[PDB]
């Protein structure tokens, strides 16, 4: 991390996560504990919402945060209205609870067995050591992470047409998108009118072009080191690299907050909720057009308004890190 | 706009009372002349002229022309009284010239007071109008 | 700036924008953030107007000023003038919001990451450094900006001739201007009746003649610097170059206020509102032809009366800055009254 | 400028305009700003009263003075003496107002950038440096100004004959005049009935005869210096030449106040109003014939009764400066009444 005008800062108990920023072993252990808590949140709150799910009522009024996402992928949906099966939603949250214990096992593994710095040990273990000033291994980490997100977008391509189908909100009996709209001219013009989607062949075809770009750039960052022009304009520091991802996540969060309240095809109001509108003013928040029965907010309202505030606090959290990485103030 | 002030020509209270206006002087048509002169003003519900002093030039003769005519005369009285008091102060006996006014010196100052605003601006610019605070008798705080 | 008598003068927080007049790096950072704030207004208020747009009423009376400019281009109507598609209004405000984030990036780049003075940089950062005493570098900046303005005027006439055409009010439909104007006798005669133009074909050939002129002046200012004709008659101070641009944009703002009051073709009446008689009172203004309910002034009257007051005060700011550049300290007036 | 022998007269703020009377560059700057303020009033108040103009009513009763001036020249007038075009009043009111901005810029140029004294300047400004006690330089200034006044009177004759047409108050139409008078006897006969000419073809021919006289007079003043008899009988001080100008423009004010009130040709009654009766009270004033109520004073009673007072108070201003130029100290009044 960026030490403020010196070499080593002895951080206090309040800023306790600034202490291990130069430690490679504790960097792995803290980050896979975040993924353990993310897989626990994906797993335990899947089963939490099953226990509070009434299929007679509307699914949007019960605050389902993970069930309409699983209904969008098509794990056991019904064309006659309400979702029929429950065990596909049960096994997905049970798998994430298993993977949270596996990721939680790796949280304590690199905490205690591994040292704080991954250079004391050897034997194909010193290769998994990174330094914030060294560009070569950071391109290896970025190249390998983009290979999984390239495969993650390819896994949706495997799911849509080799391993199942995708729920289409118009036909209501999936679509099973086999050959999508693979047009480079369509996806280039879709930079602006992305608020509403009319066909999911653009979604499956968009994930083809995103995934091939991600696996194309993933294998590119593996082969070559970072260039000198990227070293010149971008600071290669601990807080600087954090500021680059915190800017992109907050950019992704603001898009995800806007895409929740305005989309009706990949976010169908059958089980997500009716769409919303942006209420500008002192607090820009998304307010429900639909009238909830007794002082409630729907799932689309809860997803959009939380992700707007979380990306805003990431935006202000990026300003605390980017001004510190440049050494401008505080 | 004065929506509660009708003009006196169209005010029925004034129109029923202007026919009984008394004569203030020896002229037997003094009340008739006052009835025509006060018709151009603004009247209230009781038919009497209500004057407007806010600064409108339609009602400039209500206050502004009285203001210009007064301040010229009152400036004249103040300026010739100040200039006579300065002139007799330089004499051997300034005290006796106030209870026994030098009348030819007083008439000389009083006829010269028609150019008081030009003399007041010039004396303010010369510093002889306003005395400095260090040169004035002062209370012991 | 001016540096009255002695140099190394300091400015307070109410005049703190004048401190970076000699700093080239911070001069970029303030101006690009102005273009970031300008493109943010061009994008967010395109979204603000389309959220408040109702197609039942007319275009001008609702208080929307941005979308009539795009409808004049032919990007809001297909037939009738009712404005039936809001998709080309969405692509413009989203692009200007993207470009404002790009211009917001480089502006904060030049005030925190890049140095505040470009004279300490090496490579292309030394070639971008400028000072307010070198006319050769100021001719490089002016010549390259004049190339961009000439390309901007050519892209309007290029779109009007080959990429869709403009909205012609006398036929109420979009049309191609594939036969342009190439005789400069009619442009020279348009100095008098410039604002009473009733020809879309003559307007496009004007921008062809304008756009070919500002690239001619753009090329001329690059390969030839300012010389002894221009150095002796024009001051080259920090506020002197600002003063010429202040009156230069006030002259443009006075024409644009007058062109937004009597024109019917580049400002169609069904998009902006009816043309206005030129009134004058304590100050000049362009009053409405008819009194709309709850005194809602039309978008044509909101554009013309605001651009008149902006151009008057920018003329007054030109007078403040030209007096400050020439050497008047605004304190000799009080010292003469003594 | 009269200094009463004292070379170091400081002057107060109320007489602060006397400080630049010996400074040639600052003399230009105040006068050009006066022409900036004069052309601004010709421009802004043409546009002020075209907004206040009601075409149904007569413009005389509305209280407008600049639109009847342009309507008498023949702009915006149809076949019945009405007003149908608001555009030529807008163009001329714009042209005067833009030219005031050029003059307002050139006055600030001669205040700030140009030197206070033009003897310091090298080039053509050294030739423009005038001193008050140089009669040869002043006739060059006077002769060039007589050329533009002669060109202005020929332009009005040019506007009536060729570039448009004047208004005919007898036939209530805009008439292009053709072939005005050339005999000098009728213009010499117009010294008596100058205010009752009632003829366009003699008004233009009179303007031809004074346009050729002013240009020929400006030829004589540029080429020939003052001979010496005028130096003996007329003073050549700064306040002396101002005294002759204030006296000369007071006589022009008294004529134009009288010519506005009684003449119907150059001041038509459907543009201005009925010809005013020459009344007199505690002051001379030309009163309304028709006597429109509610303090109307229908726009010829404003032109004539302002150009008499402004001529009277320039006649008083001519007397203030000619007394100053001849050597009256004006403080000797105060010592006359002293003991
Ligand atoms: C990608 C995310 C990211 C990462 C990895 C870090 C990492 C770092 N930041 Mg941080 N930062 C971010 C985002 C991030 N930040 C955001 C979101 C903010 C805005 C709030 C900031 C603003 C910030 C400040 C102000 C500080 C840092 C500092 C730190 C360092 C130590 C932090 C620590 O010990 O935590 C300890 C954490 C706590 C004690 C918890 C805070 C207490 C709050 C009130 C708990 C409740 C939070 C919230 C209300 C809960 C809502 C729940 C709801 C969502 C359901 C570390 C290098 C510190 C530093 O470098 O010192 C100069 C420092 O002082 N950052
Ligand atoms: C997502 C939540 C989370 C995660 C998983 C991490 C992860 C990490 N923290 Mg922690 N921390 C958190 C949030 C988190 N923190 C919050 C919000 C606070 C602010 C209240 C802190 C404040 C804090 C302190 C004060 C320090 C850590 C340290 C550690 C690292 C070493 C732990 C270790 O090896 O144990 C065994 C311990 C050691 C080998 C020596 C480390 C020194 C002490 C004993 C660590 C224990 C502090 C504290 C009790 C940890 C729990 C905090 C909180 C979850 C209750 C570990 C990787 C340490 C660090 O950065 O490593 C250098 C450090 O000193 N944390
Ligand atoms: C950030 C995530 C991530 C990354 C990239 C690392 C990185 C590393 N692990 Mg690890 N691992 C993790 C998560 C991760 N682990 C989790 C979630 C588990 C499952 C419980 C483990 C359990 C594990 C074992 C059992 C071992 C490694 C080992 C290694 C090292 C060499 C890897 C290898 O096979 O060499 C080629 C390296 C430090 C070895 C090591 O160095 O341990 C300290 C080792 O013994 N890993
Ligand atoms: C293109 C525009 C331009 C440029 C770049 C400059 C540049 C500058 N001028 Mg300025 N000037 C101009 C035009 C311009 N001016 C205009 C139009 C005016 C006329 C009003 C002036 C009058 C002027 C003065 C009087 C002074 C300068 C000063 C300054 C300097 C510091 C300014 C500062 O810190 O702001 C500080 C800004 C503020 C404190 C904010 C004030 C905001 C007010 C209230 C206006 C708000 C807008 C208003 C509500 C209208 C809204 C319109 C609506 C459409 C949104 C700087 C060199 C100073 C200088 O050179 O001497 C040191 C100085 O004293 N200028
Ligand atoms: C359109 C809006 C606009 C933009 C684009 C800028 C642009 C600029 N301003 Mg600014 N300014 C503006 C409006 C604007 N201002 C207004 C209206 C005010 C009146 C409140 C000022 C008053 C102001 C001051 C007082 C100063 C600037 C300076 C700066 C420059 C560098 C700031 C920096 O990094 O600090 C680097 C600063 C230092 C290393 C030390 C200076 C200490 C001052 C107090 C820092 C102030 C910076 C501040 C965040 C700028 C915005 C002010 C306000 C709008 C919040 C930057 C190019 C600074 C400058 O000229 O740089 C030398 C500076 O001193 N401006
Ligand atoms: C429009 C105004 C403008 C101008 C005058 C410059 C001028 C400059 N910038 Mg640039 N820049 C700006 C805005 C501007 N930028 C914006 C809008 C961005 C895009 C986000 C950037 C991002 C930026 C980067 C990426 C870099 C520069 C750099 C440069 C320098 C050389 C650029 C070059 O060779 O061009 C061809 C020069 C000082 C470089 C420099 O000198 O930085 C220290 C540098 O690293 N700028
Ligand atoms: C039609 C209106 C008019 C015009 C165009 C002028 C023009 C002139 N006057 Mg001026 N003035 C006028 C009205 C006018 N006056 C009236 C109404 C007053 C009485 C209040 C005065 C009292 C006055 C004073 C007290 C002085 C002038 C002087 C000057 C000159 C100042 C600029 C100069 O030479 O820079 C160079 C000037 C200087 C180096 C010193 C003077 C400093 C400032 C610029 C004086 C400006 C005072 C200002 C004009 C008062 C405004 C009055 C009114 C318009 C509101 C200029 C040639 C000055 C002069 O001739 O000095 C050489 C002088 O001292 N004026
Ligand atoms: C009608 C009154 C008047 C007078 C007598 C002067 C007198 C003069 N002008 Mg001029 N000038 C005036 C109005 C006037 N100007 C106005 C209205 C403007 C704006 C168009 C200018 C702008 C102007 C410029 C910009 C220049 C002069 C200069 C000249 C000088 C003679 C140049 C020459 O022979 O041109 C042939 C002399 C000081 C020149 C000079 O010597 O000044 C430094 C000069 O640079 N004039
Ligand atoms: C605006 C009017 C104007 C002004 C102010 C002057 C001023 C002057 N002229 Mg005149 N002049 C003018 C127009 C003007 N002229 C025209 C239109 C003509 C007729 C063609 C002449 C032909 C003329 C002659 C023939 C002579 C003068 C002379 C004179 C001087 C004596 C005046 C006189 O005869 O008293 C009564 C005086 C300085 C005399 C002189 O010596 O010039 C200085 C002289 O001999 N003038
Ligand atoms: C020298 C001097 C002075 C003086 C000055 C002056 C007083 C002048 C003035 C000047 C001026 C006064 C100028 C002018 C200007 C003008 C303006 C500035 C205007 C504006 C406007 C415009 C330009 C336009 C208009 C229009 C038109 C024409 C058409 C229609 C539309 C519109 C309305 C837009 C003084 C004393 C201060 C001081 C000392 C020195």
PDB file of N, CA, C and O in Angstrom, chain A residues 189 191-193 195 233 258 280 323 326 328, chain C residues 48 87 90-91 94-95 98 109 111-113:
ATOM      1  N   UNK A 189     -23.569  -0.640 -31.300  1.00  0.00           N
ATOM      2  CA  UNK A 189     -24.579   0.379 -31.109  1.00  0.00           C
ATOM      3  C   UNK A 189     -25.363   0.266 -29.822  1.00  0.00           C
ATOM      4  O   UNK A 189     -26.131   1.176 -29.501  1.00  0.00           O
ATOM      5  N   UNK A 191     -24.290   0.494 -26.823  1.00  0.00           N
ATOM      6  CA  UNK A 191     -23.640   1.171 -25.707  1.00  0.00           C
ATOM      7  C   UNK A 191     -24.557   2.167 -25.009  1.00  0.00           C
ATOM      8  O   UNK A 191     -24.253   2.587 -23.888  1.00  0.00           O
ATOM      9  N   UNK A 192     -25.661   2.556 -25.643  1.00  0.00           N
ATOM     10  CA  UNK A 192     -26.512   3.625 -25.139  1.00  0.00           C
ATOM     11  C   UNK A 192     -27.903   3.151 -24.752  1.00  0.00           C
ATOM     12  O   UNK A 192     -28.372   3.468 -23.653  1.00  0.00           O
ATOM     13  N   UNK A 193     -28.586   2.401 -25.615  1.00  0.00           N
ATOM     14  CA  UNK A 193     -29.933   1.925 -25.291  1.00  0.00           C
ATOM     15  C   UNK A 193     -29.909   0.543 -24.635  1.00  0.00           C
ATOM     16  O   UNK A 193     -30.662  -0.369 -24.975  1.00  0.00           O
ATOM     17  N   UNK A 195     -30.756   0.056 -21.517  1.00  0.00           N
ATOM     18  CA  UNK A 195     -31.695   0.039 -20.399  1.00  0.00           C
ATOM     19  C   UNK A 195     -32.786  -1.006 -20.596  1.00  0.00           C
ATOM     20  O   UNK A 195     -33.183  -1.686 -19.642  1.00  0.00           O
ATOM     21  N   UNK A 233       1.305   5.938 -16.938  1.00  0.00           N
ATOM     22  CA  UNK A 233       0.085   6.665 -16.607  1.00  0.00           C
ATOM     23  C   UNK A 233      -0.601   6.098 -15.358  1.00  0.00           C
ATOM     24  O   UNK A 233      -1.265   6.842 -14.627  1.00  0.00           O
ATOM     25  N   UNK A 258     -28.960   0.859 -11.874  1.00  0.00           N
ATOM     26  CA  UNK A 258     -29.864   1.371 -12.898  1.00  0.00           C
ATOM     27  C   UNK A 258     -30.549   0.239 -13.651  1.00  0.00           C
ATOM     28  O   UNK A 258     -31.734   0.344 -13.986  1.00  0.00           O
ATOM     29  N   UNK A 280     -35.056  12.233  -8.446  1.00  0.00           N
ATOM     30  CA  UNK A 280     -33.939  13.124  -8.181  1.00  0.00           C
ATOM     31  C   UNK A 280     -34.264  14.058  -7.015  1.00  0.00           C
ATOM     32  O   UNK A 280     -35.415  14.202  -6.594  1.00  0.00           O
ATOM     33  N   UNK A 323      -6.838   9.580  -3.882  1.00  0.00           N
ATOM     34  CA  UNK A 323      -6.112  10.738  -3.372  1.00  0.00           C
ATOM     35  C   UNK A 323      -4.960  10.323  -2.468  1.00  0.00           C
ATOM     36  O   UNK A 323      -3.950  11.032  -2.391  1.00  0.00           O
ATOM     37  N   UNK A 326      -2.143   9.005  -4.896  1.00  0.00           N
ATOM     38  CA  UNK A 326      -1.441  10.132  -5.495  1.00  0.00           C
ATOM     39  C   UNK A 326      -0.746  11.006  -4.462  1.00  0.00           C
ATOM     40  O   UNK A 326       0.027  11.890  -4.846  1.00  0.00           O
ATOM     41  N   UNK A 328      -2.044  13.287  -2.530  1.00  0.00           N
ATOM     42  CA  UNK A 328      -2.510  14.669  -2.609  1.00  0.00           C
ATOM     43  C   UNK A 328      -2.865  15.219  -1.233  1.00  0.00           C
ATOM     44  O   UNK A 328      -2.479  16.342  -0.884  1.00  0.00           O
TER      45      UNK A 328
ATOM     46  N   UNK C  48     -32.859  14.984 -18.461  1.00  0.00           N
ATOM     47  CA  UNK C  48     -33.829  15.722 -17.658  1.00  0.00           C
ATOM     48  C   UNK C  48     -34.991  16.213 -18.509  1.00  0.00           C
ATOM     49  O   UNK C  48     -36.138  16.238 -18.049  1.00  0.00           O
ATOM     50  N   UNK C  87     -35.600   7.544 -28.935  1.00  0.00           N
ATOM     51  CA  UNK C  87     -34.331   6.820 -28.995  1.00  0.00           C
ATOM     52  C   UNK C  87     -33.142   7.653 -29.492  1.00  0.00           C
ATOM     53  O   UNK C  87     -32.067   7.531 -28.878  1.00  0.00           O
ATOM     54  N   UNK C  90     -31.868   9.692 -26.652  1.00  0.00           N
ATOM     55  CA  UNK C  90     -31.175   8.946 -25.609  1.00  0.00           C
ATOM     56  C   UNK C  90     -29.725   8.653 -25.969  1.00  0.00           C
ATOM     57  O   UNK C  90     -28.877   8.585 -25.074  1.00  0.00           O
ATOM     58  N   UNK C  91     -29.424   8.462 -27.258  1.00  0.00           N
ATOM     59  CA  UNK C  91     -28.054   8.146 -27.655  1.00  0.00           C
ATOM     60  C   UNK C  91     -27.164   9.384 -27.541  1.00  0.00           C
ATOM     61  O   UNK C  91     -25.960   9.270 -27.283  1.00  0.00           O
ATOM     62  N   UNK C  94     -26.485  10.073 -23.641  1.00  0.00           N
ATOM     63  CA  UNK C  94     -25.606   9.048 -23.090  1.00  0.00           C
ATOM     64  C   UNK C  94     -24.176   9.194 -23.591  1.00  0.00           C
ATOM     65  O   UNK C  94     -23.236   8.888 -22.851  1.00  0.00           O
ATOM     66  N   UNK C  95     -23.996   9.639 -24.838  1.00  0.00           N
ATOM     67  CA  UNK C  95     -22.656   9.873 -25.372  1.00  0.00           C
ATOM     68  C   UNK C  95     -22.008  11.065 -24.675  1.00  0.00           C
ATOM     69  O   UNK C  95     -20.830  11.016 -24.296  1.00  0.00           O
ATOM     70  N   UNK C  98     -20.917   9.985 -21.329  1.00  0.00           N
ATOM     71  CA  UNK C  98     -19.676   9.224 -21.445  1.00  0.00           C
ATOM     72  C   UNK C  98     -18.501  10.160 -21.703  1.00  0.00           C
ATOM     73  O   UNK C  98     -17.436  10.029 -21.084  1.00  0.00           O
ATOM     74  N   UNK C 109      -6.802  14.398 -13.992  1.00  0.00           N
ATOM     75  CA  UNK C 109      -5.460  13.896 -14.258  1.00  0.00           C
ATOM     76  C   UNK C 109      -4.438  15.026 -14.271  1.00  0.00           C
ATOM     77  O   UNK C 109      -3.314  14.859 -13.786  1.00  0.00           O
ATOM     78  N   UNK C 111      -4.523  17.957 -12.723  1.00  0.00           N
ATOM     79  CA  UNK C 111      -4.389  18.724 -11.495  1.00  0.00           C
ATOM     80  C   UNK C 111      -3.866  17.910 -10.322  1.00  0.00           C
ATOM     81  O   UNK C 111      -3.521  18.499  -9.292  1.00  0.00           O
ATOM     82  N   UNK C 112      -3.801  16.586 -10.440  1.00  0.00           N
ATOM     83  CA  UNK C 112      -3.256  15.738  -9.385  1.00  0.00           C
ATOM     84  C   UNK C 112      -2.104  14.863  -9.848  1.00  0.00           C
ATOM     85  O   UNK C 112      -1.136  14.689  -9.104  1.00  0.00           O
ATOM     86  N   UNK C 113      -2.177  14.304 -11.054  1.00  0.00           N
ATOM     87  CA  UNK C 113      -1.145  13.405 -11.559  1.00  0.00           C
ATOM     88  C   UNK C 113      -0.114  14.120 -12.423  1.00  0.00           C
ATOM     89  O   UNK C 113       1.089  14.006 -12.171  1.00  0.00           O
TER      90      UNK C 113
END
